[PDB]
Amino acid sequence: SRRNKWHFGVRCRGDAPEILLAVYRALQRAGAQFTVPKPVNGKYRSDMYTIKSRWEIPHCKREGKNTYAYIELQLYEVMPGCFMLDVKSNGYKDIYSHPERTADHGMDDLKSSFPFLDLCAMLVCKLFS
Amino acid sequence: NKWHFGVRCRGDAPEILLAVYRALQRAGAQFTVPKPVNGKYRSDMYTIKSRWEIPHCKREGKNTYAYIELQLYEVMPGCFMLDVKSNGYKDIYDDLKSSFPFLDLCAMLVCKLFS
Amino acid sequence: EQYSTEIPAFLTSNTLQELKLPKPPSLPPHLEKCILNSNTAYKEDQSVLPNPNHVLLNHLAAANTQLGVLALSATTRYHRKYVTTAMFKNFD
Amino acid sequence: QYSTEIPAFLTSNTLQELKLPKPPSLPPHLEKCILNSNTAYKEDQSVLPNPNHVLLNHLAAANTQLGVLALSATTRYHRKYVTTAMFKNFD
Amino acid sequence: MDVQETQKGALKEIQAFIRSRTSYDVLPTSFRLIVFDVTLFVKTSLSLLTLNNIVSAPLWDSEANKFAGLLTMADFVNVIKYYYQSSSFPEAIAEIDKFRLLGLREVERKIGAIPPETIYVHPMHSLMDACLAMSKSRARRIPLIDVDGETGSEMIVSVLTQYRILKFISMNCKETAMLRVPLNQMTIGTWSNLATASMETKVYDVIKMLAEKNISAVPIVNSEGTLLNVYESVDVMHLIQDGDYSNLDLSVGEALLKRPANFDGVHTCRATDRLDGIFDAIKHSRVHRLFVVDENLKLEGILSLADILNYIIYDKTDNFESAV
Amino acid sequence: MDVQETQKGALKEIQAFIRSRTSYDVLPTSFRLIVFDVTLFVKTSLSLLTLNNIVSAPLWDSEANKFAGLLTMADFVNVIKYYYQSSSFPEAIAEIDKFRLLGLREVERKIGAIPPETIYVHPMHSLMDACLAMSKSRARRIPLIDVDGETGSEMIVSVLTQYRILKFISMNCKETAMLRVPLNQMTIGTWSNLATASMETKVYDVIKMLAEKNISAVPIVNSEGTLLNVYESVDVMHLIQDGDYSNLDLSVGEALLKRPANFDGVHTCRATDRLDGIFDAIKHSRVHRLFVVDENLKLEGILSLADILNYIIYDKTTTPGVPEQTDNFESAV
Ligand SMILES: Nc1ncnc2c1ncn2[C@@H]1O[C@H](COP(=O)(O)OP(=O)(O)OP(=O)(O)O)[C@@H](O)[C@H]1O
Numbered sequence A: 001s002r003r004n005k006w007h008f009g010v011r012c013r014g015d016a017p018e019i020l021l022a023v024y025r026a027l028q029r030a031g032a033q034f035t036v037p038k039p040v041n042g043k044y045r046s047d048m049y050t051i052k053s054r055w056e057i058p059h060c061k062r063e064g065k066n067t068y069a070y071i072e073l074q075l076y077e078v079m080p081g082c083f084m085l086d087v088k089s090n091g092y093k094d095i096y097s098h099p100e101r102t103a104d105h106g107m108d109d110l111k112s113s114f115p116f117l118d119l120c121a122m123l124v125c126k127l128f129s
Numbered sequence B: 001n002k003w004h005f006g007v008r009c010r011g012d013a014p015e016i017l018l019a020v021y022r023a024l025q026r027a028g029a030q031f032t033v034p035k036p037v038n039g040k041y042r043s044d045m046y047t048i049k050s051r052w053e054i055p056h057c058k059r060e061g062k063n064t065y066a067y068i069e070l071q072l073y074e075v076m077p078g079c080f081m082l083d084v085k086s087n088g089y090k091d092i093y094d095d096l097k098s099s100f101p102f103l104d105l106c107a108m109l110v111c112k113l114f115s
Numbered sequence C: 001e002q003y004s005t006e007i008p009a010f011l012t013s014n015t016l017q018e019l020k021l022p023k024p025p026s027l028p029p030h031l032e033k034c035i036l037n038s039n040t041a042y043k044e045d046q047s048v049l050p051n052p053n054h055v056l057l058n059h060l061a062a063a064n065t066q067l068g069v070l071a072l073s074a075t076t077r078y079h080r081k082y083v084t085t086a087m088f089k090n091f092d
Numbered sequence D: 001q002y003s004t005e006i007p008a009f010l011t012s013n014t015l016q017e018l019k020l021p022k023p024p025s026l027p028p029h030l031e032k033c034i035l036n037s038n039t040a041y042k043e044d045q046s047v048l049p050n051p052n053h054v055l056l057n058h059l060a061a062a063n064t065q066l067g068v069l070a071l072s073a074t075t076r077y078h079r080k081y082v083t084t085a086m087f088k089n090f091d
Numbered sequence E: 001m002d003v004q005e006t007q008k009g010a011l012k013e014i015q016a017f018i019r020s021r022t023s024y025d026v027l028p029t030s031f032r033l034i035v036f037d038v039t040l041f042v043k044t045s046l047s048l049l050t051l052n053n054i055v056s057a058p059l060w061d062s063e064a065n066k067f068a069g070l071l072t073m074a075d076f077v078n079v080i081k082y083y084y085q086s087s088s089f090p091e092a093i094a095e096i097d098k099f100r101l102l103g104l105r106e107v108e109r110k111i112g113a114i115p116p117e118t119i120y121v122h123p124m125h126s127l128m129d130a131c132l133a134m135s136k137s138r139a140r141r142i143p144l145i146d147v148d149g150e151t152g153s154e155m156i157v158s159v160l161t162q163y164r165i166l167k168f169i170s171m172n173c174k175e176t177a178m179l180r181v182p183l184n185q186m187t188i189g190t191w192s193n194l195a196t197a198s199m200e201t202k203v204y205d206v207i208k209m210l211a212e213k214n215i216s217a218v219p220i221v222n223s224e225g226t227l228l229n230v231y232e233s234v235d236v237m238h239l240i241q242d243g244d245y246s247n248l249d250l251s252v253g254e255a256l257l258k259r260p261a262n263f264d265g266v267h268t269c270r271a272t273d274r275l276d277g278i279f280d281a282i283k284h285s286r287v288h289r290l291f292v293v294d295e296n297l298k299l300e301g302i303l304s305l306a307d308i309l310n311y312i313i314y315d316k317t318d319n320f321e322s323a324v
Numbered sequence F: 001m002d003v004q005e006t007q008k009g010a011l012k013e014i015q016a017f018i019r020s021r022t023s024y025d026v027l028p029t030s031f032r033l034i035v036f037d038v039t040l041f042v043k044t045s046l047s048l049l050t051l052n053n054i055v056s057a058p059l060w061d062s063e064a065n066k067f068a069g070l071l072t073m074a075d076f077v078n079v080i081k082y083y084y085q086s087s088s089f090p091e092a093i094a095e096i097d098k099f100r101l102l103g104l105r106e107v108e109r110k111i112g113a114i115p116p117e118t119i120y121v122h123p124m125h126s127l128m129d130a131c132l133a134m135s136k137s138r139a140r141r142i143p144l145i146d147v148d149g150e151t152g153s154e155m156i157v158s159v160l161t162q163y164r165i166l167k168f169i170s171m172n173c174k175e176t177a178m179l180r181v182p183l184n185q186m187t188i189g190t191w192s193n194l195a196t197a198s199m200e201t202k203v204y205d206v207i208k209m210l211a212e213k214n215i216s217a218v219p220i221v222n223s224e225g226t227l228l229n230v231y232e233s234v235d236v237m238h239l240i241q242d243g244d245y246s247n248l249d250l251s252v253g254e255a256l257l258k259r260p261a262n263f264d265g266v267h268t269c270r271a272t273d274r275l276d277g278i279f280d281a282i283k284h285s286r287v288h289r290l291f292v293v294d295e296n297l298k299l300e301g302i303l304s305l306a307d308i309l310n311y312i313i314y315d316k317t318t319t320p321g322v323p324e325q326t327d328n329f330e331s332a333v
C-alpha cells in the first residue's frame, strides 16, 4: 500500500522487440519450451507477442512422471516505452492420465495456482538476471 | 541494545563454565582444565587459557596457533560476563598484534556458545 | 499449439534495424486493476476479496516489497468459490 | 598444560554439587566501552577517547537488530589505536 | 421445556449442524490467502505478518509443491521459551534471525515443539473433521489442503480458525439463542489455577507461561486482582517485529505501551452469563477468549474459544504452545 | 616575492611535507574502524552503513583473513547504473537486496565496474604514495593495510579520505596561508562541459551521469542556471536504505526532500578565490566539493578535492592513468 501494490504480470520498458527477446531468452534458460513467431510470408505480426510455453513441472519430472505446465504470455504496450508482460496459466497435464482413472463430469476438477506461481516465479528470476 | 565487554551470562557460574568448555570443545579449541589446590578447586577455574588452530594457516601450511584467555566475572547475582582476551599469535617456529584472527575466533566461540 | 527450444533466428541477429516489426497490443481495461487492490472493514476477514472476474481468472499478479522477496499471486476457483493465493517467495 | 577434554566434574548430572568456587567480581574498569563515547560528528565520529591500556585486546559485543554479530576490539597499532568493530555474519 | 433442556437440544442441533457442513462451507465466496516460501528468512517473514496484518501464514515448499506446515506466533513463543530456561546466554536468542522458516521449524522440530507431521483436513470433508482435528490438540487454526490429482501437488485452500468456525455458527444457527444456561452451572472454562501476571512480570516469564501452560494469552491483574489487560502471544510478534530481542526483558508494562491501536478487545463476562450472548458477541466482534470477572472486574475464570467449541462438539520445561 | 612565486615555493614545501609523513600520521590517535563481512547481505550492509552514520566500509573475508575490497556508495551507483540501461525490467534490480556483498561485487567484477585487485597502501608508507595511488586510480579514498607476518594476515588499519588528507595538510602546513593565486589564473578544476541536472531530472539519469562521468556529485541548477543544490551519490544510501528501489524514479526534486538534516554543505566560492581560503574552509567545515560560482550564483566550474590534492601534488608531470576510458563507471566515494 504505497503504489508498491498489485498489478498484473511484469512491468517492462524500452523496445517491444528487445523485450520479446528477453522473454524468449528467459524462457530459454529457464528450460521452458515456447511457441516461435511465424510470418505471413512478407514478415511478422502482433501475435508474435503471444508466446505459449510448455514447462516440465520440476517435481513431477524428478520423481518419474512427465507432466507439463502450459503458460501463455502476452505483451502489451501501456504507454510508449511501457509494457506489461502478462503471464497466465492455462493448465497442468500429465501425458495420460494416471496408470488408471479419470472421474470428471462436474465441473472439471482442480486448477491450482501451483506450480503455476512457482514457475511464474522461476520466470521472473530469469527475467531479472 | 549497545556495546559492552565479553559475553553476558545467566544462571549458575559453573554451568556457564561448562557451557563454555562445551562451545570451546566443538570449535576445535584446546584448553586448560581447572587446578585443584588441596581440598580441590580454585576460583582460578573460571579462567580458561585456550589454544586455537588458526584456520587459514592450518589451511595453507603454517602450524601457527592462537591464544585466548577466557575469564568469568559476576556482575550481579545470577549475572556474569565472559570476558574474552586475545593474547597471542605464535607460528610454532612491538610487531602488530592485529585484532584478527582474534575476532573471527571470537565469532566462532560465540556461535558455538549460542546453539 | 506447436513448440520449442531455440530462440528465433532474427531477433538474435541484432534488430534495432528498422524492420519495424509489429508493436504489441495495447493494455485492455480489465487488466487495469487487481482485486487484491484492497479491502473493506467489518473484519471478519480482512481476507474477503470482491467477486473476481471470470476473464481475469488465472493470471499472474505482482507487487514489490521492500523486503528482498517476490510477491506473486493468482486467483482461481475452487468448486464454486474463488481463492486468491498470494505468495511471498525468495529470489535465487 | 593444554587439555582437549572437558573436566570430569563439570560434565554430567548433579553437576550441582561438591563445592562452588565463585568467579571474581566485574572490575570497575570493564563495564565501560570506549565505543560508547562521542555521539557527535565533531570531525570524525570515528574519533575515540583513549582506551585503558590494560583492557586492551578484549572482546566487546553489541546487539544488532539485523541477525548478525557485532564484535569489537581495541588494538595498538604502532603508537595509535584502532578499535575495530566488525559486523560478522551470524552463520 | 427447561432452560437446561433447551441447551441440550440446542447443542444437539449445533453439533448436528456442524457435521452437515464442510470446512469448505465456512470459507467466504471469495477470499485471499497469503502463503510463505518455507525458505524465507525469519526476519523477513516476521515483517510480512506485520504489514499484511496477519498472525499466520501457511508455509509452501515447492520443490515439493507440498505444504510445509503452518507458521504461527507459537512458533516464536516455543523457541523463545526454549532459549530462556536453557543456554545461559541471554542474547543467544538473537540468532533466531539467521534462521529460515525451515531452519526454525527444524529447531522446533528437534526440541518437541512440533508434532512429527503438521495437521490435517480436506476442505470438502465435514466441518467436524476440522473441529476434531483442532480439538485433539490446541492447533487453534487448521489448513485446508486438497491435492491437484493431475499433478499430485497439494493445493492449500485456506486456514480455518476456531473463531471463524464459531462466528460461522453464531451466524447460521438460530439455535445459539437457546443456549441460556448460566456458566456456574456448566463444566466449561478454567477457574482455578489461573496463570496470570502483573505489569511488572517479565515478558519472557509470560512467554514462559504461554508455552508450558499451552495458552495463547494471560490475563493481567493488579494486587487486588482486578483485570487490567492481557498479554497475547501475538503481542510477541509486535515486540520483535523489528528484531529487538532484548525487547523481551521489558516488564509486561512497558511492553504494552508498544501495543499499536489495531488490537481486538479484552472481553469480559459474569459467571452468570451464557453462550447465547457469548455467541452474539462472537457474531459481531473478534473475541478470541472471554474472561469471567466479578462485579469488581475480579478474575473468576477464563472461558476460551477452544473451551466453547469443544463444549459444542461432543457432550457424550513441560512444554509447548499449540497454535494461534 | 610575487604572488605567482610565493605559491610555487609554498606548494614545494607542502609537497615535501606530504613526503615527510606516512599515511599513519593522518590517523587520529585513537579511532574506530568499522568493518563488514564480504558475506553480508546487501540489505543489511545498507542498514549498517546508515545506523553507524558512514558511507563506506572495508570488507573482510575471515575464511582467508584478507581485505576484500572497500564497499562504497559507488558500488551502488555502479550496479544501479548498470541495471537501468541494460535490462528491460524496472523492478529487477530490486534483487540487489538479495545479494551478499560478495555476489554484489562480483557483478561489478563482471561488468567492469571494479578493477581486478584493489588499491591499498602500507599505513607506514609515505603519505605521497597514498595521494598518488588515489590520483592514479581515480579512487577517492584508499584502505590502509599491513601484514601480520606471524599469521600472514591482512590487518586493515584504516581508510583515508582525500578530505582527511587535505585537512591534515591544512592543519599542519602554515604554508597554505601562502596560496593566493586566484583560480582563473591557475589551470585547475573543471570549468567547462559540466554535467548538471535540474530538480525534474530523474534520479536514475543523475545516477547515470555519476557513473560514466565518474563523479561523486552533480550540481542542480535551474532555467537561469542558478546553483540550487548538489545531488551526491551518498544521497543514494538514503534513497534505498529503506529497501525501496522505486525511490530511484523520483525527480531529484522529491528525492531531495527526503534528505535528512545531517547533510554537509554545498560549498560555493568565487572564480577569483584562492587555495589559501579554500584550504581553510577545508580546515573548518567538511567540504566535499567547491562549486565555483559567480556574483549571481551561476555555476562556472567545479573545483574538487581530487582537483586540489592532485594539483597540490604534481609540479612538472601528470600521471596519465588519466583518464582510462569513455562511459566507464565510478571510482569510489
Ligand atoms: N491463564 C490461564 N490459566 C489457566 N488456564 C487457562 C489460562 N488461559 C487459558 N486457560 C485454559 O486453557 C485452555 C486453552 O484454550 P484454547 O484452546 O482456546 O487456547 P488457549 O490459548 O488455552 O485459550 P485462550 O485463547 O483463552 O488463551 C482453556 O481451557 C482455558 O480455559
Ligand SMILES: Nc1ncnc2c1ncn2[C@@H]1O[C@H](COP(=O)(O)OP(=O)(O)OP(=O)(O)O)[C@@H](O)[C@H]1O
Pocket (backbone or CB within 6 Å): F140, F162, F189, F190, F191, F192, F193, F194, F195, F196, F214, F215, F216, F217, F218, F219, F288, F289, F302, F303, F304, F305, F306, F307
Ligand atoms: N558536475 C560536474 N560536471 C562536470 N565535471 C565535473 C563535475 N563534477 C566534477 N567534475 C570534474 O571531474 C572530476 C570530479 O572530481 P571527482 O571525480 O573526484 O568527483 P568530485 O565531486 O569532484 O569529488 P572530489 O572532490 O573527491 O574530487 C574533477 O576532476 C572535476 O573537475
